Amino acid sequence: YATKNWRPERRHTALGLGIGGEENINPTYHVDKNGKYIQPTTWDMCYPIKTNINKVL
Amino acid sequence: GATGSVGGGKGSGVGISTGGWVGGSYFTDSYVITKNTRQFLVKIQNDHKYRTENIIPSNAGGKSQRCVSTPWSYFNFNQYSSHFSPQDWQRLTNEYKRFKPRKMHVKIYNLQIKQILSNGADTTYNNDLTAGVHIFCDGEHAYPNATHPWDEDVMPELPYETWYLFQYGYIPVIHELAEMEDANAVEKAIALQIPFFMLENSDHEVLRTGESTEFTFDFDCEWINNERAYIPPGLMFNPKVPTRRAQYIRQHGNTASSNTRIQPYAKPTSWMTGPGLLSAQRVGPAGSDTASWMVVVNPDGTAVNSGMAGVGSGFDPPSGSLRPTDLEYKIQWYQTPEGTNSDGNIISNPPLSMLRDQALYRGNQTTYNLCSDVWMFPNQIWDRYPITRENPIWCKKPRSDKNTIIDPFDGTLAMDHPPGTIFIKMAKIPVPSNNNADSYLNIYCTGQVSCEIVWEVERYATKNWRPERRHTALGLGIGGEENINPTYHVDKNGKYIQPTTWDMCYPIKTNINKVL
Amino acid sequence: IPPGLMFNPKVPTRRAQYIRQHGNTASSNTRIQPYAKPTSWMTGPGLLSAQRVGPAG
């Protein structure tokens, strides 16, 4: 993309992810002490499209 | 060998070997070549899965690293005893004033994957001819490093011992942060950023039993200097030649002020003592991480109440080229994994090079007092730590914006890219399970691994008239079950007798003199 | 991670440490813990000691 927008735009970031696990210290998309893969618990953690990049109609 | 002819065909197969045993060293003037073959065993690690768990500490107050454990195993070639026999090491340190690694060649071949069948108390083994083994080299260091200097389970010193590869794992987090006391926003931000690495994210080669693989590496290295200094740089002058320099003595109570010519034996030096930290002392129980000097990183969030002995890594030897005041400042290790409680440990000693045990003394205008911390200062001159055959060769130098002079105090060669670690894993072979589960075929791999290092060396020439110190077998000890067996030999049980002192390990910077 | 944390906590080390005898703690010589592995890499430089002085002007 190229934009003439002056301002910063929304991006997907790891800081929107959650913590989970058996000891609840493990971030999303990681594994816990049992090898369980921690899953996104919300729709934003799955990083949808049509969020970040602006278009001029 | 000599006039030998192998009648195996050029085509690869189950009944054709993929290589042959290499061994021995070859000495020239410009280079030395070491050839080493080992039989290795790879087995299933971590039940075929990635896990992130806290390491349980000892009876000491809990100090725990959080690691990711992987199904993978790795080869570790980093140590001199692995590539040099005691004979070859002796000849290296007696006949050459410097050496460095030049190129490295690794070959993995003659692989065997066998199924482990448990009928009962008896255990049987059958070849799986179609089973593959996954082999991967990380040459760009895209993943966390597998190896750390002075680590155990390095390539066996003696060529006929089996090598049993260790599981690969890495520390994703600082765990005092991963503990996440109450609700802290910065610790939350640290946690959401914890990286996760699977080796499956890259391409690796899969080998069946008739296949082999090879790896090559070119070292770009600084030299390891084997020469010693017989005098300090402060003593190079002529005591009978007068000097133009004058000195002024401030008036003491009973000593008048005076301005006089410097004595011809007292001539001043422009060359400073090398850096080192003598001040701090070790803290806490043995179980906890304990070092006099503790290197920590605290991003935020803490009042640093944690008994930070575990929070930081700890920095030793701190001393550098200063003479260690205590045994606490000396590098010491054990010869075997069964070494315990000052039995089997080797404590490093002064090489008797005049660039090595150094000190500053600060005049208080009555006596001289030892100032413990000598920081980096202009015109400092020193020598690197004298390394024995039991030292690790290299260290991974961490990627960073800025660094000072790189002279690791354990003597290892620190470099941006060391030889890449070879990761090895067996194919993960599922078996059907009527109930929902993950059950796998129980298998293990054995193969031959050969490492060939080319070492660049240089011989010495001296104008010294007198004979010089050399390493000799007469400095070795006797040990064994019957106590008749010399060092570096085997006893009646097959036990290899180990050097019991630091001199028996033949350090460098002992034998060969240099004129400053 | 810091450069002091790059190692494997489950791999044992060859290195040994010596603890000087304290009053209530005896002298001991022991193997370094696999999670306690020592680092060769120092903290960067900086001056924390001094404090600001005088009026703002």
C-alpha angle B443-B448-B452 in degrees, rounded to nearest 5:
145
Residue partners of A48: CB distance under 8 A and separation at least 6: none
In chain B, residues with a C-beta closer than 8 Å to the C-beta of C6 are: 144-145, 148, 170-171, 396, 398
Chains interfacing with C (3 or more CB pairs < 8 Å): B
* Closest partner CB to A15 (pick from B47, B189, B196): B189
CA distance B146 to chain C (A): 7
Antiparallel, parallel or unpaired: β B478-479 and B133-138: unpaired
For the residues of B479-495, what is the DSSP string, one character each? ESSSS-EETTSB-TT-P
CA closest to B52 among chain A residues: A33
- The answer to whether the CB atoms of B50 and A31 lie below 8 A apart is yes
By the 10 Å C-beta count (0-12 exposed, 13-18 middle, 19+ buried), B493 is classed as exposed
CA distance A23 to chain B (A): 9
* B505, two tokens: 């390990």
Residue whose entry in the numeric block shows the structure tokens 């070492």: B455
State the DSSP H helix or E strand holding residue B94, giving kind and residue range, or none if neither. helix B86-95
Interface test with B, best of A25, A28, A32 (most B CBs within 10 A): A25
For residue A43, give the amino acid letter: W
Q: Across the interface, which of B170, B295, B402 has its CB nearest the CB of C39?
A: B295
Nearest CA in chain B to A45: B192
Report the gap between the CA of A52 and the closest CA in chain B (Å): 20
Contact C8 B288 (CB under 8 A): no
Rounded to the nearest angstrom, the gap between the alpha carbon of residue A33 and the centroid of all alpha carbons in its chain is 23
Nearest to B501 by CA among B332, B322, B330: B332
Cβ–Cβ gap B52/A33 under 8 Å: yes
Contact at CB, B178 and A25, closer than 8 angstroms: yes
**Does B398 sit within 8 Å of C3, measured CB to CB?**
yes
Interface test with C, best of B59, B75, B81, B150 (most C CBs within 10 A): B150
* Cβ-Cβ contacts under 8 Å, B194 against chain A: 27, 30
DSSP letters for B118-161: ESSSSEEEEE-TT--EEEEEESS--SPPS--TTBSSPSPSSTTS
Residue with tokens 């090398």: B274
Say if the Cβ atoms of B51 and A30 lie within 8 Å.
no
Token digits for B442? 């129980």
Q: Which residue of C has its CA nearest to B340?
A: C30
Contacts with B65 from chain C: Cβ below 8 Å:
5, 9, 35
Resolution (A): 2.5
Asked if B377 and B275 touch (Cβ cutoff 8 Å), the reply is yes
Contact (CB<8Å) C15/B332: yes
**Residue B126 in 3-state DSSP?**
strand
Overall residue count recorded for chain A in this entry: 57
Nearest-CA distance C27 → chain B (Å): 10
Q: Give dist(CA B277, CA B216) in Å, integer.
A: 40
Measured CA to CA, the distance from residue B4 to residue B169 in angstroms comes to 44
CA B400, CA B150: separation in Å to the nearest integer?
Answer: 23
Chains B and C form CB pairs within 8 A to the count of 162
Of B49, B53, B192, the CB nearest to A27: B192
Q: Is B51 in contact with A35 (Cβ distance < 8 A)?
A: yes
Q: What kind and span of H or E run contains B176?
A: helix B175-178
Residues of C within 8 A of B288 (CB-CB) are: 33, 36
Contacting subunits of A (3+ beta carbon pairs below 8 A): B
Interface contact flag, B52 A19, Cβ < 8 Å? no
CA distance C3 to B190: 17
> Which among B50, B54, B192 has CB closest to A14?
B192
The Cα B22–Cα B5 span in angstroms is 16
Rounded Cα distance, B54 and B174, in Å = 11
Partner-chain contact A25 B196, CB within 8 Å: no
Task: Give CA–CA dist B242/B417, Å, rounded.
Answer: 52
**What are the structure tokens assigned to B357, written together?**
């045990």
Task: Say whether the peptide bond before residue B317 is cis (omega within 30 degrees of 0).
Answer: yes
3-state class (DSSP) for residue B46: helix
Contacts of B53 in chain A (CB under 8 A): 33
- Chain A neighbors of B169, CB-CB under 8 A: none
Is residue B493 a contact partner of residue B481, using CB atoms and an 8 Å limit?
Answer: yes
- Identify the contact set of chain A against chain B, taking CB-CB distances under 8 A: 14-15, 17, 19, 23, 25-35
Q: Which two tokens stand for residue B404?
A: 């000072």
Q: B390: buried, middle or exposed (CB in 10 Å: 19+, 13-18, 0-12)? A: buried
Q: Would you call A17 and B178 a contact, using CB atoms and an 8 Å cutoff?
A: no
Count the alpha carbons within 13 Å of A41 in the hemisphere toward its beta carbon: 9
Nearest to B144 by CA among B421, B414, B426, B424: B421
Whether residues C41 and B398 touch (CB distance < 8 A) is answered with yes
The alpha carbon of residue C1 and the mean position of all alpha carbons in its chain are separated, in whole angstroms, by 15
Nearest alpha-carbon partner for B390 in B130, B150, B111 = B150
Interchain proximity B192–A25, CB inside 8 Å: no
Contact yes or no for B420/B217 (Cβ under 8 A): yes
